[PDB]
Amino acid sequence: ERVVIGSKPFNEQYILANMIAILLEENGYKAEVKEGLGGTLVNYEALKRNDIQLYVEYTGTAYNVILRKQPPELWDQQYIFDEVKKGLLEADGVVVAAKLGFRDDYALAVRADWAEENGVEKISDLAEFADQLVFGSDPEFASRPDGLPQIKKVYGFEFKEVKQMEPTLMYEAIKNKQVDVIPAYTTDSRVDLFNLKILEDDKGALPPYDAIIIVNGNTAKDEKLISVLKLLEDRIDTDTMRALNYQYDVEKKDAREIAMSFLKEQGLVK
């Protein structure tokens, strides 16, 4: 049977989607990875109407963006997971099949040398400078309720200008001073490579983004399919994902091969 895997447009989405495809294919499915749908909302819409059967979402995204729930006073990872799992099920029959084992958080990043000069270590240190800085969003952060609107509300500042670009372009854009602040993805080692500095989210504005495989309700009836997805439960930690991402973004290796190498190493395929 046919299984189409969605993806948002960045490294680990391609890698994980392919990882899932290989495991499904090893268990009798014809799996494909669909690319270029767009972001969170379009992937979730696609999942609901069965254009895709499953994709890799993050808890904090599902909570704030998809379910449009209100930030608690404190972010608690397992609480957000529990509420996402219940809310997706209650709303659309969407099933959280598996936790992959890693967070890929939004984290605000600046150039390290600028941060060092200005004594900027945490997001509230940006307040002094924010109305002079250019923000380089990925396609979603600028407009998402847990993105800049959350930075605005919790820290009380907006940036001078907001540019949007594909996720992968953020890192060079800030390195080359086209922008000054980016919502870096914490599974992307180009933060270190390009000499950027993640700022502490000292007021806890941003939620946890635990990577989860979500499946639409009709597909989740397939228990064998579900059980294949669960082979990945907790199997991919942040350093593993960062390493696999590096292989994609810096080594320019194919997403399927990166996935296959990982699965072979882990004894998940022989």
Could you tell me which residues come within 8 angstroms of residue 257 by beta carbon, excluding any fewer than 6 positions away? none
Nearer Cβ to Zn ion (106/159) = 159
Which residue in 29, 185, 248, 262 binds ligand C[N+](C)(C)C (CB under 6 A)?
A: 185
Smallest gap from Cβ 168 to Zn ion, in A, equals 23
83: partner contacted, choices Zn ion, Cl ion, ligand C[N+](C)(C)C, none (Cβ within 5-8 A by kind)? none
User: What is the spatial distance between Cα 101 and Cα 58, in angstroms, rounded to a whole number?
Assistant: 11
Of Cl ion, Zn ion, ligand C[N+](C)(C)C, none, which one sits near residue 131, judging by CB under 5 to 8 A according to partner kind?
Answer: Zn ion
Nearest in space to 53 (alpha carbons), one of 108, 99, 121, 7: 7
Tell whether residue 106 is a contact of ligand C[N+](C)(C)C (CB under 6 A).
yes
Residue 30 beta carbon to Zn ion: minimum distance, rounded to whole angstroms? 22
Q: Which of 10, 1, 7, 27 is nearest to 263 (CA)?
A: 27
Does 18 sit near Cl ion (CB under 5 A)? no
Stretch that binds ligand C[N+](C)(C)C, among 71-79, 98-106, 170-178, 193-201 (CB under 6 A): 98-106
What backbone phi and psi angles, to 5 degrees, belong to 44? -70, -45
Phi first, then psi, for residue 118 (nearest 5°) are -100, 5
131 part of the interface to Zn ion, by CB under 5 A: yes
- Does 237 bind Zn ion (CB under 5 A)? Our answer is yes
- Report yes or no: 213 and 97 within 8 Å, Cβ to Cβ: yes
Task: Name which of 231, 256, 220 is nearest 100 in CA terms.
Answer: 231
20 has which bridge partners? none
Closer to ligand C[N+](C)(C)C by CB, 29 or 81: give it.
81
User: 92 or 105: whose CB is closer to ligand C[N+](C)(C)C?
Assistant: 105
Tell me if 192 is assigned to a ligand binding site: no
Let me know: does 184 contact 196? Beta carbons within 8 Å. Answer: yes
Contact residues toward ligand C[N+](C)(C)C (CB under 6 A) are 58, 61, 104-106, 185, 209
